[PDB]
Swiss-Prot record, chains F, G, H, I, J:
Can form homodimers. Interacts with IDE and INS. Interaction with INS inhibits homodimerization and fibril formation. Belongs to the calcitonin family. The mature protein is largely unstructured in the absence of a cognate ligand, and has a strong tendency to form fibrillar aggregates. Homodimerization may be the first step of amyloid formation. Amyloid fibrils are degraded by insulin-degrading enzyme IDE. It comes from the Eukaryota. This is Islet amyloid polypeptide. Amylin/IAPP is a glucoregulatory peptide hormone that plays an important role in the regulation of energy homeostasis. Selectively inhibits insulin-stimulated glucose utilization and glycogen deposition in muscle, while not affecting adipocyte glucose metabolism. IAPP function is mediated by the CALCR-RAMPs (AMYRs) receptor complexes. Amylin can also bind CALCR receptor in the absence of RAMPs, although it is more selective for AMYRs. The modification Tyrosine amide is found at residue 25. It is found in: Secreted. The gene is IAPP. IAPP is the peptide subunit of amyloid found in pancreatic islets of type 2 diabetic patients and in insulinomas.
Length: 24, 24, 24, 24, 24, 25, 25, 25, 25, 25, 36, 36, 36, 36, 36
């Protein structure tokens, strides 16, 4: 369904799903 | 369905889906 | 369903799902 | 269902799911 | 269901699930 | 000299790559 | 000289890669 | 000289990779 | 010289990799 | 010189890898 | 290295000091894949 | 390196100091793929 | 290294001092995969 | 190393001092996989 | 090392002093896997 594929990415990754009110 | 493919990207990635009111 | 694949990523990874009100 | 695969990632990993009000 | 696979990761790992109000 | 950040949220890559002069070779 | 951070949240990679001059070789 | 951090939360990689000048070889 | 941290929470990797000059070889 | 930490919580890896100059070989 | 595929390199009196770069330093390959 | 495909390099008295660049430093390849 | 595929390298009087880089230092491969 | 695939390296009078890098130092492989 | 696959290395008068790196120091492999 949901596929996250990161290759040598610079920075954080945010694949969070269906979470209630994320605050960063 | 949803496919995220990042190759040597510079910056954060935001694939978050169906989350309620994301605040960054 | 939900697949997280990170290759030599620089930064934290946030695959948290269905959590209530994450605060970082 | 939920699959976390991290290869030589630099930083902490946050796969926490269904937790109530995580505070870091 | 929930699968955590970390290969030579640098940093702590947080797979905690259904815990009440984690404070770190 | 002093520097800080109060409530910033940097979602990416910062590449200063600073180096001190070395006169190599 | 002094530096700090109070409530910052850095979600990424910082690459200063500083080095002192060494005059190698 | 003094430095600290009070309530910071660094979610990533910091790569200063500092080194002192060594004049090797 | 003095340094400390009061309430910081470092969730990652810090790579200073400092070394003293050695003049090897 | 003196250094300490009061209430810090380091959730990761710190890699100073310091070494004293040795002039080997 | 004859009659068959081969790769070789020779270096002497060498120095390299490069800033942050997303690749190997002076790499060489005949047919292989550099997917690091 | 004859009668078959080959790649080779020779260097001496070399110095390189390049700013942040998205590729290898002085790479060479005959047929291979640089997908780093 | 003849009549069959081979890889070889020779180095002497060498020095390398590179800043943070996302790859091996002076690597060489004939057919293999560098997936580190 | 003839009539069959082989890998070899020879080094003398060598020094290496590299900053933090995400790969082996002067590695060589003919066919193998570097997945460290 | 002939008529069969083989790997070999020879070194003398060697010194290595590398900063923190995520890989072996001067490793060599013909066909094996480096998954450390």
């Amino acid at each position: 369904n949901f596929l996250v594929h990161s290759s040598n990415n610079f920075g954080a990754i945010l694949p969070s799903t269906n979470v209630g009110s994320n605050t960063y």
